[PDB]
Write a protein that holds these residues in place. Structure first.
Motif, PDB file in Angstrom:
ATOM      1  N   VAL A  51       0.808  -1.213   0.000  1.00  0.00           N
ATOM      2  CA  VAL A  51       0.000   0.000   0.000  1.00  0.00           C
ATOM      3  C   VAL A  51       0.847   1.271   0.000  1.00  0.00           C
ATOM      4  O   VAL A  51       0.338   2.341  -0.345  1.00  0.00           O
ATOM      5  CB  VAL A  51      -0.978  -0.032   1.189  1.00  0.00           C
ATOM      6  N   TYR A  52       2.134   1.187   0.342  1.00  0.00           N
ATOM      7  CA  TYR A  52       2.958   2.388   0.332  1.00  0.00           C
ATOM      8  C   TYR A  52       3.338   2.802  -1.082  1.00  0.00           C
ATOM      9  O   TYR A  52       3.558   3.988  -1.332  1.00  0.00           O
ATOM     10  CB  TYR A  52       4.213   2.182   1.182  1.00  0.00           C
ATOM     11  N   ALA A  53       3.421   1.846  -2.012  1.00  0.00           N
ATOM     12  CA  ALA A  53       3.709   2.114  -3.421  1.00  0.00           C
ATOM     13  C   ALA A  53       2.651   1.368  -4.219  1.00  0.00           C
ATOM     14  O   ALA A  53       2.877   0.255  -4.690  1.00  0.00           O
ATOM     15  CB  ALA A  53       5.119   1.676  -3.788  1.00  0.00           C
ATOM     16  N   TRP A  54       1.502   2.000  -4.392  1.00  0.00           N
ATOM     17  CA  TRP A  54       0.323   1.320  -4.898  1.00  0.00           C
ATOM     18  C   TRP A  54       0.263   1.346  -6.418  1.00  0.00           C
ATOM     19  O   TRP A  54       0.659   2.328  -7.048  1.00  0.00           O
ATOM     20  CB  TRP A  54      -0.928   1.942  -4.285  1.00  0.00           C
ATOM     21  N   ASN A  55      -0.225   0.249  -7.001  1.00  0.00           N
ATOM     22  CA  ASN A  55      -0.200   0.121  -8.453  1.00  0.00           C
ATOM     23  C   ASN A  55      -1.273   0.991  -9.086  1.00  0.00           C
ATOM     24  O   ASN A  55      -2.439   0.941  -8.689  1.00  0.00           O
ATOM     25  CB  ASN A  55      -0.396  -1.334  -8.872  1.00  0.00           C
ATOM     26  N   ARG A  56      -0.877   1.783 -10.079  1.00  0.00           N
ATOM     27  CA  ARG A  56      -1.774   2.708 -10.756  1.00  0.00           C
ATOM     28  C   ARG A  56      -1.820   2.362 -12.232  1.00  0.00           C
ATOM     29  O   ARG A  56      -0.797   1.991 -12.815  1.00  0.00           O
ATOM     30  CB  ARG A  56      -1.311   4.153 -10.570  1.00  0.00           C
ATOM     31  N   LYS A  57      -3.000   2.471 -12.835  1.00  0.00           N
ATOM     32  CA  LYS A  57      -3.151   2.241 -14.264  1.00  0.00           C
ATOM     33  C   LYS A  57      -4.245   3.140 -14.819  1.00  0.00           C
ATOM     34  O   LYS A  57      -5.337   3.216 -14.252  1.00  0.00           O
ATOM     35  CB  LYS A  57      -3.474   0.775 -14.550  1.00  0.00           C
ATOM     36  N   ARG A  58      -3.965   3.738 -15.974  1.00  0.00           N
ATOM     37  CA  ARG A  58      -4.927   4.557 -16.693  1.00  0.00           C
ATOM     38  C   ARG A  58      -5.563   3.612 -17.718  1.00  0.00           C
ATOM     39  O   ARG A  58      -4.876   2.771 -18.297  1.00  0.00           O
ATOM     40  CB  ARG A  58      -4.233   5.722 -17.396  1.00  0.00           C
ATOM     41  N   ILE A  59      -6.868   3.741 -17.936  1.00  0.00           N
ATOM     42  CA  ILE A  59      -7.589   2.874 -18.861  1.00  0.00           C
ATOM     43  C   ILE A  59      -7.897   3.652 -20.132  1.00  0.00           C
ATOM     44  O   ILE A  59      -8.508   4.724 -20.080  1.00  0.00           O
ATOM     45  CB  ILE A  59      -8.875   2.322 -18.222  1.00  0.00           C
ATOM     46  N   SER A  60      -7.474   3.107 -21.273  1.00  0.00           N
ATOM     47  CA  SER A  60      -7.724   3.719 -22.569  1.00  0.00           C
ATOM     48  C   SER A  60      -9.131   3.378 -23.052  1.00  0.00           C
ATOM     49  O   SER A  60      -9.893   2.675 -22.386  1.00  0.00           O
ATOM     50  CB  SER A  60      -6.680   3.263 -23.585  1.00  0.00           C
ATOM     51  N   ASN A  61      -9.470   3.862 -24.244  1.00  0.00           N
ATOM     52  CA  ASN A  61     -10.825   3.740 -24.764  1.00  0.00           C
ATOM     53  C   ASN A  61     -11.114   2.314 -25.213  1.00  0.00           C
ATOM     54  O   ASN A  61     -10.275   1.664 -25.843  1.00  0.00           O
ATOM     55  CB  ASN A  61     -11.024   4.709 -25.924  1.00  0.00           C
ATOM     56  N   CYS A  62     -12.314   1.842 -24.898  1.00  0.00           N
ATOM     57  CA  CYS A  62     -12.697   0.444 -25.081  1.00  0.00           C
ATOM     58  C   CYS A  62     -14.215   0.354 -24.941  1.00  0.00           C
ATOM     59  O   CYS A  62     -14.898   1.373 -24.796  1.00  0.00           O
ATOM     60  CB  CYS A  62     -12.007  -0.447 -24.049  1.00  0.00           C
ATOM     61  N   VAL A  63     -14.746  -0.870 -24.978  1.00  0.00           N
ATOM     62  CA  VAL A  63     -16.098  -1.163 -24.503  1.00  0.00           C
ATOM     63  C   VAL A  63     -15.974  -1.941 -23.196  1.00  0.00           C
ATOM     64  O   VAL A  63     -15.230  -2.927 -23.114  1.00  0.00           O
ATOM     65  CB  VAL A  63     -16.951  -1.899 -25.560  1.00  0.00           C
ATOM     66  N   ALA A  64     -16.614  -1.434 -22.147  1.00  0.00           N
ATOM     67  CA  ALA A  64     -16.330  -1.870 -20.781  1.00  0.00           C
ATOM     68  C   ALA A  64     -17.488  -2.715 -20.272  1.00  0.00           C
ATOM     69  O   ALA A  64     -18.441  -2.195 -19.684  1.00  0.00           O
ATOM     70  CB  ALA A  64     -16.076  -0.672 -19.875  1.00  0.00           C
ATOM     71  N   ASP A  65     -17.396  -4.025 -20.481  1.00  0.00           N
ATOM     72  CA  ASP A  65     -18.417  -4.945 -19.998  1.00  0.00           C
ATOM     73  C   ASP A  65     -18.214  -5.186 -18.507  1.00  0.00           C
ATOM     74  O   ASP A  65     -17.220  -5.793 -18.095  1.00  0.00           O
ATOM     75  CB  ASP A  65     -18.375  -6.255 -20.783  1.00  0.00           C
TER      76      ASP A  65
END
Lengths: 48, 49
Positions: free
Chosen positions: B5-19
């Motif tokens: 939790v001190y170095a938490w994983n981050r991700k940006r989500i690109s354009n898609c269809v999100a089921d």
């Protein structure tokens, strides 16, 4: 006066409430917001 | 492996269809709390990022 009665698990008693979401309040027992009743819930060990 | 939790994983989500059908088929889900939305009405909004 409507008396409804059942058994649930130990860490599930918080879900029996108006306006909640969980695996027991989704489609087993949904308590509406117009709730004027009273929820009684006690520990049932050894009998059940 | 999840990072701590001190170095938490981050991700940006690109354009898609999100089921969101998937993401429901995982676990008994000890906590599922949306705040600005509601999970019953999640498949109609379209967030930018």
């Amino acid at each position: 006066v409507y008396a409804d009665s059942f058994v649930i698990r130990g860490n599930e008693v918080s879900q029996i409430a108006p306006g909640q979401t969980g695996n027991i309040a989704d489609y087993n027992y949904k308590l509406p917001d117009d709730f004027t009743g009273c929820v009684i819930a006690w520990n049932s060990n050894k009998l059940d | 492996r999840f990072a701590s939790v001190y170095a938490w994983n981050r991700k940006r989500i690109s354009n898609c269809v999100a089921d969101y059908s998937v993401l429901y088929n995982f676990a008994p889900f000890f906590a599922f709390k949306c705040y600005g939305v509601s999970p019953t009405k999640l498949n109609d909004l379209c967030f930018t990022n």
